[PDB]
Design a protein around this ligand. Structure first.
Ligand SMILES: Nc1ncnc2c1ncn2[C@@H]1O[C@H](COP(=O)(O)OP(=O)(O)OP(O)(O)=S)[C@@H](O)[C@H]1O
Ligand SMILES: Nc1ncnc2c1ncn2[C@@H]1O[C@H](COP(=O)(O)OP(=O)(O)OP(O)(O)=S)[C@@H](O)[C@H]1O
Ligand SMILES: Nc1ncnc2c1ncn2[C@@H]1O[C@H](COP(=O)(O)OP(=O)(O)OP(O)(O)=S)[C@@H](O)[C@H]1O
Ligand SMILES: Nc1ncnc2c1ncn2[C@@H]1O[C@H](COP(=O)(O)OP(=O)(O)O)[C@@H](O)[C@H]1O
Ligand SMILES: [Mg+2]
Ligand SMILES: [Mg+2]
Ligand SMILES: [Mg+2]
Lengths: 486, 257, 329, 348, 318
């Protein structure tokens, strides 16, 4: 055992909930939830509380790193006399091993708690489990699906801790469990802690530089503690005389997300005469290099949804948008050449400049609305889902149509609509005899009739006309089709 | 011409199985004395050297010394498609061309004539085994295999230390260590279990575990493995056959300390 | 059957020792002094294709160890797999053990390491320096951008300059000594200018013009034979075509171009290069002329690289030259 | 109807008599018929003439087809499936189905059918070559094209390649050279009108005069299949009574493109460009080729009369540029939005 | 046959005082070593500044004779997947070892930028839990490639390029220890061609010393081949097209440089050209990328580079 060898972050860790600086409301809500979990379990979790918290069995912790998520989750379980079961990224987590190891500890009792203390009546929940799943983001080895399935068939407090909530892999956690958001604390919460540390270590700290220390490391208090500890070995006076070097040498190089990268590259402040030397082009290309999978899509999605501020004299908004789109097309050509054969990966920075930097710089200004999510990822999936159905229909009709999968969609389907659907509108339920004698000719079925109607666009929209015909003819057509043999 | 008729069929299969997955390309030299071969590993660390005289062959006829290079994968493919009850004959024409492996049953007429196209391996015939070794020893193959495959689970390096009437195998890894110390002793009732040792200077040197695990695969041929060790010399692991011998020349791993 | 005379001239005249490597004197001298003093750091040869890198390193490996170089020297060319799983096992085991035959430092020749993945080079970055007092690495490359900066820094950079005229002339004389043959001085100058530094193209076209003699023992290889063997345009009709394009009208210029390019079966891709090389010497009294003259010609060359047409591109070259030679007036 | 009234021999082709005579000439000596490549406008009647020549050289039982399924595997585990329209004398493939795995399909199936031969009874094995039909050859990938070009001369006594495609330009020079090139001109108005007259006298549709068929032929731009289909749709909607006053039924996508051109020519702003991108998304998502969208949009824009000469000239220039860019990319919307922005900047 | 160690390895510093890099960070590491309470640290910087040697001397001074069993270094040659980081690193973390009071076990993870994200994720808690016995120390070249939590737990320590003064001091030390005849001009040329790289500087020193004996400007500029990016930067800033073309012909093309390397170097130089404006930089980069695409299809003659230079001059002049 030793007291000095500690890492300055475990000797000063909060040992009680009244020491967690910042986000009082979130930790208070979580404490009330963990306290009323038993009362909500008595009502089978089917009665929402004052804040609507008793209807959720599992808790979710998300926020920027280094704020006290794990610390709060440990202290709230230690204060109520519970027992702490903690699984983390180092342990192997998969649907098999998760259903093997912790599934049995989901509805069982504690074996070590029974020997802890039972002579005095402290609390009735000193024999139960609180399973803390930490760092849910890292599931490189049933990472999110099985854990989300644990949120419904649970019988013990289930606290989950992650870093970023809106990531697509952890979407199932959306409405199956309660979630709370921990924010970056201000400079007023950690100031008392930092001054008390400075008092207990015989080294000066001006109360005026702590705000800059919190600003250079956005929301990681542990980073501030490590910064102070590393510098307090040779310099014991940290004031406004050397704060610039500290703030410049200890910056945080966080990775930017599709929303933030677009918001940054679309800001008209960098491409000005002053900002061009404070945020150089090398940094702009590194911004793309942080995520080369979504940045071009984001830029193509929201390059014309902003109000520029770098418009050259004479050049309007439409011309700038046109040049941005031309460079977008060129970057698309470069990207296709990159991801084609020969695996030309040395052409990446040219794509970074053509697809992202140039169209952004051309329409750089102040964004009017919000950063919209890219739409091409969903449109391509829809196009593929429709192409599958078109190929199926074409290979069903190949015996008689004698036309490619392209010439059928552009030409045949307009007349097939008149032949198939129109008799059901103008003639009613007595045209059921005619329509069938059509589809048996082209080997169609009910599934093909369901798909053919969905292709038409423009004035002819069938997804609304289908709801207009009576339901009795709908129920009779399927029966007539299933009854007769081909 | 070259005609080599074996007495059995599985003999050549068991002979090749010693260094099946250890070397890829070999080159058999056939002379009036017998078949010799030497082949270097892919990483140029160990060398397999095989010598089989005219004792294991039922019939042998070779006029002039011939060299026949071939890969071991296709050779093993050809030996696998032959039944172990036939008689094997290696046939080579006047000039070195595709070698003819012929399987002929002893009861029913089954002529299985396979061809194997030769590779053009540079004839850098090597001359080792004339170097005076500092220490020589011999011990049963089962004990060596057990010791080496028990020590291989603790590390990737194995230090062999021959000291005054003591043999020491030391494995030092991450999870732990292990030391097997044996002493020379000879029994009269079981002359095959005796461990023999003749030393001139104490010798301590390291080897890798993968190469030892690949070498001990040859323990299916004989039962008494010989080990010759010497400073600044490749370690010699010899298996004695009924007609010749199969020897592995392993390179020792130097120590930075 | 098999003998030294059956090999092509590209390999038959391979330099055995370092003394038969002309041109790169300032690198061969340093390498010989390295091996003489006893110290030989990690080398990195970087040069254009066909300069002498592989020959130099093979001669060095022969000089260091002996006449049997491919015995204790490892060589990983582009023909073997060089993934991360290879640099982990094979190269490390070769660099962590001693030799089998003698007592010396081991040599590892990574030929054409520009074709290695970034992970393989990053893995090699530490094993190249962990075992230094036992093994030495030699990295041969043609494109110095495929290598990561770390691996590029750990090795001593030796650039192989293209062979100057004197070196190729000495090699031509040495080849003409061993092979009964005679070669004209103007033919020698044309061959030097066509070489473009490539020592392999020299020997190739030399074997070609020797084969096209019908008696390679008495008749001398004139410039016409060399120009015919490779089909390259002679400077004479090249300058004639350039003059007819610059001075004459459209009809007669197109006629003389189609007559010159059909008299010997020339190619437009070579005519463009020849005209560019001849016309780079002119003193244009403006900057806007050369800009268009280069841009349009490069576009036409890139289009020829795809083989669209054959006469439309020729008239395009004519039009580009004529329109570029108009801002002068 | 489209599929009902179709010629099934060479003595029944009733348009382009010169091409029919040339096909009859090529059907005299079957054992010396080289590889064929049909090129021409879309819906000209290329597949029907191909299957008619194929019936003229083989027996009449070539029309009875059957669909089969073949499963291939790439270098990885991704298993692909293709449909083959086989007949006892030939087989038809649509290699354009696979995205970038056509090189595997060609070099596998063509080799498989080239090595072995055909055996069937209809004097047990002796037969002539087998025919492979390739639909939409213009969409073939360059490496697949090289494989197909090389698997032509090696095994020539067994496989005869009869390919068809419109806009022959994306065909490499070797394939263009090592095969015969046959052009299929679209039928004239006086012949498509006769086709329509035969259809209307056979199907018993009530028409007043011959001007309706002339208007249909003029609207179809020469396309026989689209004209027949529009005639059938007009007969269906007009309740078995064709009159001199009938609205020509343009397909839905044509009307969408026309409304798009109206929106373009009316309002030249980025706010209209957003709705333009939305319309292009809705169009591409419903299985419409981007090149066809671009062609229709550009021609309808040139159709607009309120634009002068310079506007239409710059429009056609930008269209040629973005059409060149469209065949060298994958994300087609990335080029279509750029072309729309350029035409908006051009108009004002 | 004995082969002497290279000057880069024979004179590799084995004492933390011999490091001539950044004075502040080296003094911090020195005080940490004399005290012993070493916290987790990431060391990153330009290739060839002394990060690995600094952390290695730190470990050797902190553990002394226990360096054989107290340090577990994992390089890129050794496996660094999830399996090893979960099994071996953990088993070494809990390894009970009796060290002096103010000492700790150290884990040297060199080349941290090559590890998978899952490895760092699994390493987070393994490092955080046993802080009383294990103090990790990462040494990479790109701090952006490390995940955020692992980087935030440790105390970051940036490294800047070696100034010419430090390089000349170490060069003078080497010459004094090796008894070599030198002149000031040769040392200045070596520093200028070293582009702030200690290993490259020492290698070029040894090369020229063994090649000619006298370290003079002629010998180094003869067999060191003055750096590439500077010539390309000089080429792209010429006044008239003829001067830039002559530079490309004589200095780049005639000296045997592949066209792809010239194009890539020109792109990288224009990427960091702070003199010219932003729009001209973007247009120059676009034209250089067009030329790069033309080069990658196979056609890489001198005419393509000439037309690229002509286009850059047409762009910059108007
Ligand atoms: N509000 C706070 N008040 C005091 N100390 C804090 C606070 N937040 C964090 N700490 C310190 O930070 C350390 C605990 O780290 P945590 O913030 O709990 O890590 P985390 O929240 O789980 O974020 P991850 O897991 O690294 S993404 C201890 O040294 C605490 O003293
Ligand atoms: N300096 C030289 N002196 C004499 N002959 C040379 C020289 N350089 C090349 N040659 C000839 O060219 C042949 C091949 O040269 P290599 O050194 O193998 O080419 P290289 O340096 O490996 O370049 P690569 O590998 O094609 S990029 C030799 O066998 C010689 O015939
Ligand atoms: N500050 C320094 N003082 C003295 N020698 C140094 C210094 N920095 C580097 N060296 C020399 O460089 C070699 C060790 O450098 P390394 O630690 O390998 O460089 P590095 O920081 O690890 O960067 P990498 O790993 O190559 S990307 C030895 O030859 C040292 O003598
Ligand atoms: N000579 C002809 N007589 C009657 N109809 C024809 C003739 N030639 C083509 N057609 C019509 O063309 C239609 C088929 O067109 P198709 O060959 O599929 O176009 P494509 O050649 O583009 O594939 C058939 O419905 C048929 O009625
Ligand atoms: Mg945590
Ligand atoms: Mg080479
Ligand atoms: Mg290092």
């Amino acid at each position: 055992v030793r007291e000095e060898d500690k890492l300055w972050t475990v000797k000063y860790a909060p040992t009680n909930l009244q020491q967690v600086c910042g986000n009082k409301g979130s930790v208070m809500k979580l404490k009330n939830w963990l306290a009323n979990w038993e009362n909500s379990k008595k009502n089978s979790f089917k009665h929402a509380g004052k804040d609507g918290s008793g209807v959720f069995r599992a808790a979710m912790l998300y926020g920027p790193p280094g704020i006290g998520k794990t610390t709060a989750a440990h202290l709230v379980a230690q204060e109520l006399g519970y027992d702490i079961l903690e699984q983390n990224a180092s342990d192997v987590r998969s649907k098999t091993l998760l259903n093997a190891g912790v599934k049995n500890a989901l509805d069982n009792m504690s074996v070590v708690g029974y020997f802890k203390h039972n002579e005095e009546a402290q609390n009735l929940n000193g024999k139960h489990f609180v399973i803390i799943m930490d760092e849910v983001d890292g599931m490189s080895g049933g990472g999110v699906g099985q854990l989300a399935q644990f949120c419904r068939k649970t019988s013990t407090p289930l606290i989950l801790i992650c870093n970023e909530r809106n990531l697509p892999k952890m979407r199932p956690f959306d409405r199956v469990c309660l979630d709370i958001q921990f924010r970056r604390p201000d400079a007023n919460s950690i100031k008392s802690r930092l001054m008390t540390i400075a008092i207990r270590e015989k080294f000066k700290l001006d109360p005026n530089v702590i705000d800059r220390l919190i600003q250079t490391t956005r929301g990681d208090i542990r980073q501030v503690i490590n910064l102070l500890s590393t510098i307090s070995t040779t310099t014991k006076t940290i004031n406004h005389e050397n704060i610039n070097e500290i703030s410049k040498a200890w910056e945080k190089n966080i990775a930017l997300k599709p929303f933030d990268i677009a918001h940054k590259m679309l800001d008209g402040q960098i491409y000005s005469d002053i900002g061009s030397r404070n945020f150089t082009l090398n940094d702009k290309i590194a911004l793309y290099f942080d995520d080369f999978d979504f940045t071009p899509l984001m830029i193509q999605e929201n390059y014309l949804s902003t109000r520029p501020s770098v418009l050259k004299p004479g050049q309007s908004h439409l011309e700038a948008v046109a040049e941005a789109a031309n460079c977008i097309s060129l970057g698309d050509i470069v990207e296709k050449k990159i991801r084609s054969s020969e695996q030309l990966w040395s052409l990446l920075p040219l794509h970074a400049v053509l697809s992202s930097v140039y169209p952004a710089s051309k329409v750089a200004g102040h964004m009017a609305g919000r950063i919209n999510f890219t739409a091409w990822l969903g449109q391509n999936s829809k196009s593929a889902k429709y192409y599958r159905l078109l190929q199926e229909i074409h290979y069903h009709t190949r015996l008689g149509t004698s036309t490619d999968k392209i010439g059928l969609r552009l030409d045949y389907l307009p007349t097939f609509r008149k032949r198939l659907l129109d008799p059901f509108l103008k003639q009613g339920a007595d045209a059921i005899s005619s329509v069938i004698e059509v589809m048996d000719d082209y080997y169609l079925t009910k599934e093909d009739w369901d798909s053919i109607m969905e292709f038409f666009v423009g004035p002819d929209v069938t997804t609304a006309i289908i709801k207009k015909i009576p339901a009795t003819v709908k129920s009779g057509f399927t029966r007539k089709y299933n009854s007769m043999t081909h | 011409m070259l005609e080599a008729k074996f007495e059995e069929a599985s003999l050549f299969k068991r002979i090749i199985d010693g260094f099946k997955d250890c070397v890829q390309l070999v080159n058999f030299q056939c002379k009036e004395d017998g078949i010799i071969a030497q082949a270097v590993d892919d990483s140029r660390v160990l060398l397999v050297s095989l010598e089989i005289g005219v004792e294991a062959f039922q019939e042998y006829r070779c006029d002039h010394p011939v060299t026949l290079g071939m890969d071991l994968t296709s050779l093993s493919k050809i030996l696998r498609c032959g039944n172990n009850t036939d008689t094997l004959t290696l046939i080579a024409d006047n000039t070195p061309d595709s070698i003819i492996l012929l399987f002929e049953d002893t009861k029913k007429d089954r002529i299985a004539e396979y061809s194997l196209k030769l590779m053009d391996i540079d004839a850098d015939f090597l001359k080792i085994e004339e170097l005076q070794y500092d220490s020589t020893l011999s011990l049963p193959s089962s004990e060596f295999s057990k010791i080496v495959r028990d020590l291989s689970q603790l590390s990737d390096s194995i230090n062999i230390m021959i000291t005054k009437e003591t043999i020491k195998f030391v494995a030092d890894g991450d999870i732990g260590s292990g030391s097997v110390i044996i002493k020379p002793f000879v029994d009269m009732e079981h002359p095959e279990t005796s461990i023999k040792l003749e030393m001139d200077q104490p010798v301590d040197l390291t080897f890798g575990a993968k190469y030892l695990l690949d070498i001990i695969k040859g323990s299916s041929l004989s039962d008494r493995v010989g080990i010759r060790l010497s400073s600044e010399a490749p370690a010699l692991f010899q298996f004695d056959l009924k007609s010749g011998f199969l020897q592995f020349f392993l390179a020792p791993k130097f120590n930075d300390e | 059957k098999r003998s030294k005379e059956n090999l092509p001239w590209v390999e038959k005249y391979r330099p055995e020792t370092l003394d038969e490597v002309y041109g790169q004197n300032e690198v061969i001298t340093t390498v010989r002094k390295f091996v003489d003093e006893g110290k030989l750091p990690h080398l990195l040869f970087y040069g254009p294709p066909g300069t002498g890198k592989t020959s130099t390193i093979v001669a060095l490996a022969r000089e260091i160890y002996g006449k049997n170089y491919s015995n204790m020297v490892l060589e990983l060319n582009a023909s073997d797999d060089r993934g991360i799983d290879v640099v982990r096992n094979q190269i490390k085991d070769f660099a962590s053990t001693r030799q089998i035959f003698s007592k010396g430092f081991k040599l590892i020749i990574l030929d054409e390491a520009d074709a290695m993945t970034n992970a393989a080079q990053n893995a090699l970055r530490r094993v190249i320096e962990r075992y230094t007092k036992n093994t030495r690495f030699c990295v041969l490359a043609n494109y110095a951008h495929k290598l990561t900066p770390a691996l590029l820094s750990r090795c001593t950079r030796f650039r192989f300059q293209p062979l100057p005229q004197e070196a190729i002339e000495r090699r031509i004389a040495n080849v003409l000594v061993h092979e009964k043959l005679k070669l004209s001085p103007n033919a020698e100058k044309a061959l030097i200018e066509l070489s473009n530094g490539d020592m392999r193209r020299v020997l190739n076209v030399l074997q070609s013009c020797k084969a096209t003699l019908d008696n390679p023992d008495e008749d001398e290889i004139s410039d016409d034979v060399i120009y015919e063997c490779c089909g390259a345009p002679r400077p004479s009709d090249l300058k004639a075509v350039l003059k007819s394009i610059l001075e004459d009208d459209w009809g007669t210029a197109h006629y003389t171009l189609n007559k010159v390019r059909s008299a010997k079966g020339l190619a437009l891709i070579d005519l463009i290069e020849g005209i560019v090389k001849i016309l780079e010497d002119y003193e244009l009294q403006n900057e806007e002329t050369r800009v268009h003259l280069l841009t349009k010609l490069a576009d036409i060359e890139y289009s020829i690289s795809k083989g669209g047409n054959d006469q439309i591109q020729g008239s395009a070259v004519i039009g580009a030259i004529k329109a570029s030679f108009e801002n002068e007036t | 109807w489209v599929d009902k009234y179709r010629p099934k021999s060479l003595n029944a082709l009733s348009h382009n008599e010169e091409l029919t005579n040339f096909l009859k000439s090529l059907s005299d000596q079957p054992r010396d018929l080289p590889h064929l490549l049909l090129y021409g406008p879309n819906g000209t009647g290329k597949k029907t003439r191909c299957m008619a020549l194929l019936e003229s050289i083989f027996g009449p039982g070539v029309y009875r087809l059957k669909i089969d399924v073949r499963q291939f595997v790439t270098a990885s585990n991704r298993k692909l499936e293709l449909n083959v329209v086989s007949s006892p004398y030939h087989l038809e493939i649509t290699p354009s189905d696979m995205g970038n795995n056509d090189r595997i399909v060609i070099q596998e199936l063509l080799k498989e059918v080239a090595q072995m031969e055909q055996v069937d009874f209809q004097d047990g094995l002796a037969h002539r070559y087998k025919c492979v039909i390739i639909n939409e050859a213009n969409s073939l990938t360059k490496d697949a094209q090289a494989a197909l070009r090389r698997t032509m001369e090696k095994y020539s006594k067994n496989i005869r390649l009869i390919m068809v495609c419109d806009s022959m330009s994306p065909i490499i020079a070797p394939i263009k050279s090592r095969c015969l090139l046959i052009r299929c001109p679209a039928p004239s108005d006086s012949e498509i009108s006769t086709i329509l007259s035969d259809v209307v006298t056979n199907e018993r549709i009530q028409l007043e005069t011959k001007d309706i068929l002339k208007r249909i032929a003029q609207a179809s731009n020469g396309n026989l299949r689209v004209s027949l289909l529009m005639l059938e749709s007009m007969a269906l909607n007009n309740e078995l009574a064709l009159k001199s006053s009938s609205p020509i039924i343009k397909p839905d996508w044509i009307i969408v493109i026309h409304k798009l051109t109206r929106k373009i020519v009316k309002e030249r702003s980025v706010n209209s460009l957003i709705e333009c991108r939305a319309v292009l998304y809705d169009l591409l998502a419903h299985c419409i080729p981007a090149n066809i969208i671009l062609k229709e949009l550009t021609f309808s824009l040139l159709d607009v009369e309120t634009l002068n000469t310079t506007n239409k000239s710059s429009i056609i220039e930008y269209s040629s540029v973005f059409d060149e860019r469209l065949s060298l990319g994958n994300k087609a919307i990335f080029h279509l939005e750029g072309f729309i922005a350029k035409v908006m900047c051009c108009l004002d | 046959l004995s082969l002497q160690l290279p000057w880069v390895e024979k004179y590799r510093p084995q004492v933390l005082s011999d490091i001539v890099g950044n004075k502040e960070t080296i003094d911090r590491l020195q005080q940490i070593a004399k005290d012993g309470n070493m916290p987790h640290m990431i060391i990153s910087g330009m290739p060839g500044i002394g990060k690995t040697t600094s952390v290695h001397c730190l470990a050797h001074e902190l553990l002394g004779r226990s360096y054989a069993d107290g340090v577990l270094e994992l390089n890129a040659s050794d496996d660094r997947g999830i399996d090893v980081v979960r099994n071996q690193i953990k088993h070494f973390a809990q390894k009970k070892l009796h060290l002096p009071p103010g000492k700790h076990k150290i884990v040297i993870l060199d080349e941290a930028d090559s590890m998978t994200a899952g490895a760092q994720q699994a390493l987070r808690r393994t490092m955080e839990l046993y802080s009383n016995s294990t103090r990790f120390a990462f040494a990479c070249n790109q701090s952006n490639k490390i995940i955020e939590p692992l980087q935030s737990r440790c105390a970051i320590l940036r490294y800047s390029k070696l100034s010419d003064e430090d390089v000349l001091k170490r060069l003078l030390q080497i010459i004094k220890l090796e008894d070599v005849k030198y002149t000031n001009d040769g040392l200045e040329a070596i520093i200028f061609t070293a582009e702030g790289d200690m290993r490259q500087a020492i290698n070029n020193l040894q090369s020229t010393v063994a090649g000619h004996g006298l370290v003079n400007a002629d010998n180094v500029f003869k067999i060191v081949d003055s750096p590439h990016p500077l010539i390309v930067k000089k080429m792209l800033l010429a006044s008239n097209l003829e001067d830039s073309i002559q530079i490309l012909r004589t200095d780049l093309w005639k000296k045997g440089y592949s066209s792809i390397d010239i194009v890539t170097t020109s792109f990288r130089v224009t990427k960091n050209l702070a003199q010219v404006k932003e729009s001209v930089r973007l247009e120059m980069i676009k034209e250089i990328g067009l030329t790069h695409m033309r080069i990658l299809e196979g056609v890489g003659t001198y005419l393509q580079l000439a037309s690229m230079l002509a286009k850059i001059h047409k762009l910059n002049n108007k």
